[PDB]
Each structure stands twice: as structure tokens, then as C-alpha cells.
Symmetry: C3
Subunit: 173 residues, 3 copies
């Protein structure tokens, strides 16, 4: 949990979603069904809206924010890796945001995309569907393989099940 409203705007969280009590969700944030927000993950909807599509996960120590005129939209089946940071960007469906990677303002990530760990997607950068992105500044290095494409969805499914495990079996001690 650790949900807050700011100036009237309240987060809209679907009942099936899992928001760790150590995560922080503030203001204009929408979490669709079967989404999950993990420990120390922060979704600060105090400027533009932060929309998180169904079956998507926002892992441990992630930050999601926006800039004026630059809302953040996360698609379906999106995996936002541990310690990653998404800032005022649009992310398509079946996208794996690598651990500790960074997606900046105005960027547009296509569907079925994998952003490598530690990669930095520059402002306004557009990433085509089925791409593997690496480096700083991140560049499309090649297209995803059949295996990787399957994974762009399975990674998210694994988290949907994991989220449910926590909702039913977590206990503070």
C-alpha cells in the first residue's frame, strides 16, 4: 500500500492488483487488473498521470515519474525491472525494461521490446516493435528472437502469479 492522494487526485487501483505496503503510490495513478508494485517502488503521479496497463509489474526500487505535458503510459504485460526508472514516456505492450535501465521523456517504446540492463533510452527516442535495445544512449542492436518474444510475455505472467502469492501469503513478523 502506502497510497496517497494529492490535491483531490486519488490513485485508481484495480482490486486484483498488488501494491506492496513499502511501495509508494501518489496521486494521478491508474493500476489495472493483475498489476503489481513492489517494495520501494515509487509511482509519483503529482504532475502528469501515470497509467499502468494490466498484467504489468513495477519491480523493487523503481521510480516512475513525469514532466509537464509528458504523462507516463505503461502498456500491458510490461516488466519494469528492479531499480529501473521511467520518466514521462510511453511504453507499449510486452516490453521488458531492463534492471537499472532508464527511459526518458518523450520516448516511445514499441511492442515486444527488450531494453537491456543499464541501458538509457534518450528523450523522444522511438523504438520499433520487436527490438533489442542496448547501451547509453540506447540503440536498437537487432530484432528479438522467437524465444525472446515469448519471454516478453512470460516474464509478466510469472509476476502475475508471484503477485497473487504475496496477496495471499505475505505476513509481517
Amino acid at each position: 500500500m502506502a497510497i496517497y492522494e494529492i490535491n483531490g487526485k486519488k490513485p485508481r487501483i484495480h482490486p486484483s492488483a498488488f501494491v506492496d505496503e513499502n511501495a509508494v503510490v501518489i496521486g494521478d495513478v491508474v493500476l489495472e487488473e493483475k498489476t503489481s508494485v513492489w517494495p520501494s517502488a515509487v509511482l509519483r503521479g503529482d504532475i502528469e498521470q501515470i497509467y499502468v496497463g494490466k498484467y504489468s509489474n513495477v519491480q523493487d526500487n523503481v521510480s516512475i515519474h513525469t514532466s509537464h505535458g509528458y504523462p507516463t503510459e505503461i502498456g500491458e504485460y510490461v516488466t519494469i525491472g528492479h531499480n529501473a526508472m521511467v520518466h514521462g514516456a510511453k511504453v507499449g505492450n510486452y516490453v521488458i525494461i531492463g534492471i537499472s535501465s532508464v527511459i526518458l521523456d518523450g520516448a516511445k517504446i514499441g511492442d515486444h521490446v527488450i531494453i537491456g540492463a543499464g541501458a538509457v533510452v534518450p528523450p523522444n527516442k522511438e523504438i520499433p516493435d520487436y527490438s533489442l535495445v542496448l547501451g547509453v544512449p540506447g540503440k536498437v542492436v537487432r530484432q528479438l528472437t522467437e524465444e525472446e518474444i515469448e519471454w516478453t510475455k512470460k516474464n509478466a505472467e510469472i509476476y502475475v502469479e508471484l503477485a497473487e502469492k504475496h496477496i495471499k501469503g505475505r505476513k509481517r513478523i
Copy 2:
């Protein structure tokens, strides 16, 4: 909030500052007027002092620490981007520390400087005023433009207003 003292040393926080209750401020830490510390941001003043100049922001999931003999001094109008990490360094005025970047021990960042997202400033590295720094190890790639210089201050001003919004309108639900 989530403020703690350690062995007698208590943080000195100006009344106008905003410290998110999910942030963690420990020991020898000084926060001047109109400063702001956001969710999961950690300022651990358990070794050397951590000084944060007025109008500066320490964003979500940032860590600020020190090494023996290496205190951390943040200037005025400094923006420490989401998930960044400052360790025993001296940062001048009107500096934007990029998202997920790293500033190491002994480094000295001049005034009106922009450190790119994911950049790593090596130990004892000195950055001249009006510089744009990119890479790992971070290097001065060019001087800031008129627009960027204006931004080195406006970024901080935006946060001063944002901080006030939170102080007056945040509500746990």
C-alpha cells in the same frame, strides 16, 4: 519524515523543507529552506556530514552517503535525479544530477553543470562550471547552451513548487 538521530547527532531541517515520510534522513544532515527529499530517498549522515543547500531536491530512490574524511556538500538549486547516488562529493550550485547517475568520493562538480542520466563521475574528478558531462567514466563533452543553463535553475524551482504542493495537499489513504 522517517528522521533519525545517531549517537547524539540530529538532522537540522529548515521548516520550509519537505521530507517525504517514506524518505530516510539519519544523523548529521542539514536541509536548508525550500529543499525536498522524496520517497525512498536516503540521506545517511552516519559518517561525515551531508549538507543540502537551499532550493535543492533529492528525488525518489536516491542515496546520499559519505566516506571518512569525505563529507557530501550539495549546493543551492541542485536537482538530484531519480535513483541517482552521490557519495562523499562536493556539488556546486545549479547542478542537475542525471537520473540514475553516480558521483563518487572526492569529486567536485562546478556550478551550472548537467550530469547525464546513467553517467558516472569518477573519484576526485573535477568538473568545470557550465559543463555537460556524459559517459562512464563521465567526461565533459561540451559546454551548456543558454537554454540548458536556464534549466539548471528552473528544474529546481519546479521542485520548490512541487514540494509545497505535497506539504499542503498530501493525504494518506
Copy 3:
């Protein structure tokens, strides 16, 4: 603290260890004597076990997780730097994981190793003993010097003392 069990599995924490109340320890996690987990550090043992050897520290805003079939084992005298991320990897003794670095699944870090800040150790990557690793993807650039080797242990010792300071002198205010 902020310790939780999940589906029966409870963390096993030695009495001498220090777990900041703002850190998050979940499930199958073992913390040996004189270990320390700092603010916003997250050890999610909800898949494979996370084992932390004695005298090791998991610094501020770190995340430690695993993948199915890929448990995370941290050796003795290991320093996991601020904002770093270890995912389903095996780390030897006297290893310094650089600030904001990333160690991926299947990797095996030898003993007396230093991973540079912001470095990314690729999946299944094996790092020889006494190595300095830099870059993305991280590569062994040279062997450690006498000074650095001494440091691979002293860094951890400093934290053992620091941990004790917190256990005895921390006070919420």
C-alpha cells in the same frame, strides 16, 4: 526490520545482524552474523533463497532477487554498494559490488573482486579471483593491486562497525 514471511518461509536472521526498519526482507532469506541491510534495501526471497554470508553489507536502495533455479548466494565480507542490484547470482568472498552496478542471473563472481560503479555483469559471466571489472558488459580489465585487495575486506569491516553503531545508537525522532 520490515521482515515478512511468505507461504511459511521465514527469514533466518542472526542476532548480531542489523536490518534497518526501512529495509525489506521477505521469505527465504538467510542473514549471517554481523551482516547489515540498510534503508530501502530489498531482499525478496519469494522464488529462490537469498543467502548472505557473515560480515557482508547490503547498502541503501539495493535490490536482491532471484529467478527460478537461480538462487542468490552472497559470500563473506561482501560489500553491495548503494543502489546496486544482484539477480540470481553467486558472489564469492571479499567482493565489492560497485554503486549502482548490476550482476545478472547465473553470473559467478570470484573472491577478492571489485565491480566498478555502474558496471553490468552479464548472465552466466564468470569473474576470476582478484579481478577488477568495468563496463557494460562488464569485462575484467586487470588484476587488483595489493591496496585494493586489502580494501576488499576493510570495506566490509568498516560496515560491521557502522552496523553496530546503528544497533546501539539509532533513535527515531
